[PDB]
Design an enzyme around this catalytic site. Structure first.
Site, PDB file in Angstrom:
ATOM      1  N   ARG A   3     -62.847 -88.844  77.622  1.00 33.11           N
ATOM      2  CA  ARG A   3     -63.852 -88.929  76.572  1.00 33.11           C
ATOM      3  C   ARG A   3     -63.689 -87.775  75.589  1.00 33.11           C
ATOM      4  O   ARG A   3     -63.977 -86.621  75.917  1.00 33.11           O
ATOM      5  CB  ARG A   3     -65.253 -88.920  77.182  1.00 33.11           C
ATOM      6  CG  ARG A   3     -66.373 -89.174  76.187  1.00 33.11           C
ATOM      7  CD  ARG A   3     -67.632 -89.630  76.906  1.00 33.11           C
ATOM      8  NE  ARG A   3     -68.780 -89.695  76.009  1.00 33.11           N
ATOM      9  CZ  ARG A   3     -69.611 -88.679  75.795  1.00 33.11           C
ATOM     10  NH1 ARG A   3     -69.418 -87.521  76.413  1.00 33.11           N
ATOM     11  NH2 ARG A   3     -70.632 -88.821  74.963  1.00 33.11           N
ATOM     12  N   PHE A  57     -66.869 -82.355  68.244  1.00 34.29           N
ATOM     13  CA  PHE A  57     -67.872 -82.150  69.280  1.00 34.29           C
ATOM     14  C   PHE A  57     -67.242 -81.495  70.513  1.00 34.29           C
ATOM     15  O   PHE A  57     -67.384 -80.287  70.717  1.00 34.29           O
ATOM     16  CB  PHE A  57     -68.537 -83.487  69.632  1.00 34.29           C
ATOM     17  CG  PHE A  57     -69.535 -83.409  70.764  1.00 34.29           C
ATOM     18  CD1 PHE A  57     -70.162 -82.213  71.101  1.00 34.29           C
ATOM     19  CD2 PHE A  57     -69.840 -84.546  71.497  1.00 34.29           C
ATOM     20  CE1 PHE A  57     -71.066 -82.156  72.145  1.00 34.29           C
ATOM     21  CE2 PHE A  57     -70.745 -84.497  72.540  1.00 34.29           C
ATOM     22  CZ  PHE A  57     -71.360 -83.299  72.863  1.00 34.29           C
ATOM     23  N   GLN A  80     -63.897 -84.126  76.975  1.00 30.49           N
ATOM     24  CA  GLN A  80     -64.418 -84.221  78.336  1.00 30.49           C
ATOM     25  C   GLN A  80     -63.378 -84.732  79.333  1.00 30.49           C
ATOM     26  O   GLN A  80     -62.632 -85.672  79.047  1.00 30.49           O
ATOM     27  CB  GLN A  80     -65.655 -85.123  78.367  1.00 30.49           C
ATOM     28  CG  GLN A  80     -66.267 -85.299  79.748  1.00 30.49           C
ATOM     29  CD  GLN A  80     -67.475 -86.212  79.732  1.00 30.49           C
ATOM     30  OE1 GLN A  80     -67.869 -86.718  78.682  1.00 30.49           O
ATOM     31  NE2 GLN A  80     -68.070 -86.429  80.901  1.00 30.49           N
ATOM     32  N   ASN A 131     -72.729 -83.406  83.444  1.00 28.21           N
ATOM     33  CA  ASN A 131     -73.570 -83.794  84.577  1.00 28.21           C
ATOM     34  C   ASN A 131     -74.272 -85.132  84.385  1.00 28.21           C
ATOM     35  O   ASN A 131     -73.992 -85.859  83.432  1.00 28.21           O
ATOM     36  CB  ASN A 131     -74.585 -82.691  84.932  1.00 28.21           C
ATOM     37  CG  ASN A 131     -75.539 -82.367  83.789  1.00 28.21           C
ATOM     38  OD1 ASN A 131     -76.333 -83.209  83.366  1.00 28.21           O
ATOM     39  ND2 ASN A 131     -75.489 -81.128  83.311  1.00 28.21           N
ATOM     40  N   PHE A 135     -66.519 -80.118  80.143  1.00 24.87           N
ATOM     41  CA  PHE A 135     -66.136 -80.329  78.754  1.00 24.87           C
ATOM     42  C   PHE A 135     -65.802 -79.025  78.037  1.00 24.87           C
ATOM     43  O   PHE A 135     -66.311 -77.955  78.382  1.00 24.87           O
ATOM     44  CB  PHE A 135     -67.177 -81.151  77.981  1.00 24.87           C
ATOM     45  CG  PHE A 135     -68.521 -80.495  77.864  1.00 24.87           C
ATOM     46  CD1 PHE A 135     -69.400 -80.486  78.937  1.00 24.87           C
ATOM     47  CD2 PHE A 135     -68.922 -79.920  76.668  1.00 24.87           C
ATOM     48  CE1 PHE A 135     -70.645 -79.901  78.827  1.00 24.87           C
ATOM     49  CE2 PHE A 135     -70.164 -79.329  76.548  1.00 24.87           C
ATOM     50  CZ  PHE A 135     -71.030 -79.322  77.628  1.00 24.87           C
ATOM     51  N   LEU A 151     -77.218 -78.417  73.751  1.00 29.79           N
ATOM     52  CA  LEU A 151     -76.900 -78.556  75.168  1.00 29.79           C
ATOM     53  C   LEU A 151     -77.340 -77.337  75.977  1.00 29.79           C
ATOM     54  O   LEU A 151     -77.192 -77.313  77.204  1.00 29.79           O
ATOM     55  CB  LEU A 151     -75.399 -78.794  75.358  1.00 29.79           C
ATOM     56  CG  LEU A 151     -74.827 -80.058  74.718  1.00 29.79           C
ATOM     57  CD1 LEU A 151     -73.356 -80.234  75.069  1.00 29.79           C
ATOM     58  CD2 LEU A 151     -75.631 -81.269  75.148  1.00 29.79           C
ATOM     59  N   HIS A 160     -76.738 -77.794  80.372  1.00 29.91           N
ATOM     60  CA  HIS A 160     -75.396 -77.778  80.940  1.00 29.91           C
ATOM     61  C   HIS A 160     -74.908 -76.360  81.197  1.00 29.91           C
ATOM     62  O   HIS A 160     -74.960 -75.503  80.313  1.00 29.91           O
ATOM     63  CB  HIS A 160     -74.427 -78.544  80.039  1.00 29.91           C
ATOM     64  CG  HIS A 160     -74.781 -79.989  79.891  1.00 29.91           C
ATOM     65  ND1 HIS A 160     -74.188 -80.979  80.643  1.00 29.91           N
ATOM     66  CD2 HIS A 160     -75.697 -80.605  79.107  1.00 29.91           C
ATOM     67  CE1 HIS A 160     -74.714 -82.147  80.317  1.00 29.91           C
ATOM     68  NE2 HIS A 160     -75.630 -81.949  79.389  1.00 29.91           N
TER      69      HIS A 160
END
Lengths: 170, 11
Positions: A60, A65, A68, A107, A118, A127, A131
């Protein structure tokens, strides 16, 4: 602080080494989990597969951004396994998502840390507190940029992004 | 949106 590395391939082509510093002095449990999964130290997990990032992919990738990865279990974004025999708690949220190269845990809500992680390609302030940040890319961020380049808005890559080799550097 | 989850990808 320990330093670990990924040697990456993008579309089968060698792309370089990503070097990550792990914040063991801030997040000892989370760092050790990541560090151990880089070396393969622990052998075979409950999934029957080596507790090792080696050969796993970035499944991903969203440009601007983050990238992942960390699913060495199902290889599709649903899997992953920690070294502690189960999902582990959010150790702390001392470190914040302060910019590119930030290394943080993916998660499924609170206290569900596995092996999925990530690497930020920008500030991801939203975030913070959700995270666990536990590392920072200190060399080879340009390799992360190469990974970012094959990403898309959906997160689907257009070339396979693979951790060809990995381990501990110091 | 822009999340990073493991299982159910959200908006």
């Amino acid at each position: 602080n320990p330093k670990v590395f990924f040697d990456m391939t993008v579309g089968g082509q060698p792309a370089g080494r990503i070097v990550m510093e792990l914040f063991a002095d801030v997040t000892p449990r989370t760092a050790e989990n990541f560090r151990a999964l880089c070396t393969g130290e622990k052998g075979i997990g409950k999934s029957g597969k080596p507790l090792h990032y080696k050969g796993s992919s970035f499944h991903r990738v969203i440009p601007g951004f983050m990238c992942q990865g960390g699913d060495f279990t199902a290889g599709n974004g649903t899997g992953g396994e920690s070294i502690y025999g189960s999902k582990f708690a959010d150790e702390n949220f001392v470190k914040k998502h302060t910019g590119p190269g930030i290394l943080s845990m993916a998660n499924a809500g609170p206290g569900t840390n596995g092996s999925q992680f990530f690497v930020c390609t920008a500030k991801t302030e939203w975030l913070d507190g959700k995270h666990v940040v536990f590392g920072q890319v200190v060399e080879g961020m340009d390799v992360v940029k190469a990974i970012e380049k094959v990403g898309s808005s959906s997160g689907r890559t257009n070339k396979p992004v693979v951790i060809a080799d990995c381990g501990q550097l110091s | 949106x822009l999340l990073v989850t493991a299982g159910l990808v959200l908006a």
